[PDB]
Design a binder for this molecule. Structure first.
Ligand SMILES: *C(=O)CCCCCCCCCCCCCCC
Lengths: 49, 41
């Protein structure tokens, strides 16, 4: 087929959603410290005892 | 601001083990001393 010169420009692009977040967890009180700092506060407590 | 990592505190846990190790030494040295000196009587 034939085409005119372009009337609008574009390029392929990516659309993503915006996870609203705002959804805390039940045990979200453990986030400050990483998981390994709790697996080792529990191994130090058995040790020191 | 992510969760605090083990490396960040990996040092406290050493002083703990080291202290626990020193503790057992201090105890068994007294024991050793108190042991022989008793048999020697
Ligand atoms: C009498 O004098 C005998 C004393 C024996 C002492 C043995 C060593 C004490 C405990 C050391 C524990 C080290 C734990 C960490 C290893 C990596």
């Amino acid at each position: 087929i034939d085409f005119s010169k372009p009337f609008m420009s574009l390029g392929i692009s990516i659309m993503i959603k915006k996870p609203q977040k705002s959804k805390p967890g039940v045990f979200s009180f453990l986030d400050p410290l990483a998981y390994e700092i709790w697996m080792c506060i529990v191994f130090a407590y058995i040790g020191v005892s | 601001t992510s969760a605090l990592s083990l490396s960040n505190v990996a040092g406290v846990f050493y002083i703990l083990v080291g202290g626990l190790g020193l503790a057992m030494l201090v105890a068994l040295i007294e024991f050793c001393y108190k042991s022989r000196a008793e048999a020697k009587r």
